[PDB]
Structures are given as C-alpha cells and as structure tokens.
Structure 1
Amino acid sequence: NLTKEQHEWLNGWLELWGAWVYSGRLEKRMSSVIAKFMESRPMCNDDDGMLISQVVDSVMYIDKKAFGILLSYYAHGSSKHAIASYYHRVARPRKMLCRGGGRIQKPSLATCRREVDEILNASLFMIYPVLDSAFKNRKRVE
C-alpha cells in the first residue's frame, strides 16, 4: 500500500491523465490497450499526458484485466461499484475453498467489490515509483 500522501499525489495525476486519455489525445501507437479501450474534467498537458501514458503502459501491460479496470476508473470515470457490478455480472465459476470442502461457484458481489478495490490499489502501488522516477528523470535531463 502507498502512504496516504503518495496516494493523493498519484490519484491526482491519474485523474488528470484519465481525462486527457478520454479526450482522445493519446496516439494509438503509444498503447494498443488504451487505443482498444478508447475504441469502445480538467486534464494535464500533452507532455505530461504522454509521459504518464508511457509509464502506465510500461507497468500495466502485464495484467490486461487490471489495465482495463484502471482505464474504466480513471479514463471513463466509472465508480468502483459500477466496475464491480460488471465484473460480477461476467464472472466465471471459481473453485472456492469453503468450510467442509471445495465447491464451484461464481463469486459474490461483495467479493467482486473487494477484488476491484484490491486491483486498483495494487495497480497504483506498481505505478507510483515509476511515475515518481519518470518526473524526476525528466527534471534531471531537461
């Protein structure tokens, strides 16, 4: 988990970046995931939008599911509850280790809400050091 101040800082940047992405300003070549997402609010400037997009793509490409959830929340502006409702609606049957033995069952809505929150938190944790270093790298060289 990030500290409260680190979260406020990164969440702020991701809100600005998300609005910039949603306005269509990211070139398709810079991220196929973002481009595919966009085929289906104050904003940062273009230099910052590109820098953040390169950071996010370079971190989140490993987990397309989490990447999509990040884009739903920050770019489209969907609430965590709205993302979890759809996540729950399309969820696959899972092997659940219950008391007395395992069973096959689709996850509850409460479980899907917790998982969406955890996925967003884990994504911000991964993004934070890379974005912090990206801004510091730009400052150093320029």
Structure 2
Amino acid sequence: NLTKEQHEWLNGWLELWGAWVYSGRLEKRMSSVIAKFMESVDDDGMLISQVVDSVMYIDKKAFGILLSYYAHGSSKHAIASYYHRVARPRKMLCRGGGRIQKPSLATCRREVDEILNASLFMIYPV
C-alpha cells in the first residue's frame, strides 16, 4: 500500500498532469486511448504521460477512469454511479448469497476505490 505523502505528492502531480493534458497539449502518439480521450473534448506532462501510459497501458479501462477523474475532474460518486448503471450480473458470494445478479452501488464505490488505490499503487515507483 502507498503512504499518504505519496498520495498527496503523486496526487498533485496527476492534478497538474491532467490539467496539462486536458487542455489538449498532448499528441496522438502517446496513446490511441489518450487520443480517444482527446476525441472526447509541458515536458512534465509528457514525462508523466509516458509513465502513466507505460504502467496503465495494459488495462485502458481504469486508465480511462483515471483520465475521467484527473483529466476531466469528475467526482468519484458519479463514476461509480454510471459504473453501477453499466453493470452486468456476476457471481458474488454476497451478503445475500452466491446468486447471479447486478451488484449494489456501494460495491461499485468499493471497486472504484480499490482500482484507484491499485492504480496509484502501480503508478508510484515509476
């Protein structure tokens, strides 16, 4: 797990990073997913963009979520809201049981939280 100084440090880096990118100052060549986000609208931001694209290159879903939170500046609650909207029925050993249904909102909140913590966790040493 990361610490909280690392949280605030790299948090501020992703704040100026997403504020830098979202103005449109980044090129297509960094990612086609970064290009995808730029279809939906300095060396610091390009260095970090190589970092974040390098680590979060492989998932692209939480990478897009990461752009939604930092580049766009969206609240966590709306992200888990739409994410609960796009939910499919899954197998979970629930408080209810191992039946197969669409999960609750608070579960989706937990998932945005843990994909946040794991995302930041995988970014930080890079």
Instruction: Tell me the secondary structure at the aligned position of residue 24 of structure 2.
Output: coil
1:106 has 2:107 as partner:
no
The structure number with the bigger radius of gyration is 1
Deviates more, 1:91-100 or 1:73-82: 91-100
Relative distance call for 1:127 and 1:87 in structure 2 (3 A) is same
Change (3 A) 1:118 1:100: closer
Structure with the higher fraction of residues in helix conformation: 1
Deviations 1:29-73 (CA, angstroms, capped at 9, x unpaired): 111111102212xxxxx1101000000000001112211111100
Q: Which residue of 2 aligns with 1:128?
A: 124
Alignment of 1:32-71 (within 5 A): 32-40=32-40, 46-71=42-67
Q: Percent identity?
A: 100
**Structure 1: 5+ residue runs without aligned partners?**
41-45, 130-142
Change (3 A) 1:81 1:99: closer
TM-score (norm. length: structure 1):
0.83
Greater than 6 Å deviation, 4+ residue runs: none
TM-score normalised per structure 2: 0.93
What is the CA–CA distance in structure 1 between the aligned matches of 2:73 and 2:102, rounded to whole Å?
A: 27
Please give the root-mean-square deviation of Cα atoms over the aligned residues, in Å: 1.3
Q: CA deviation at 1:15?
A: 0.5
Matched residue, 2:12: 12
Secondary structure of the 1:23 match is helix
The alpha-carbon deviation at position 91 of structure 1 amounts to: 1.1
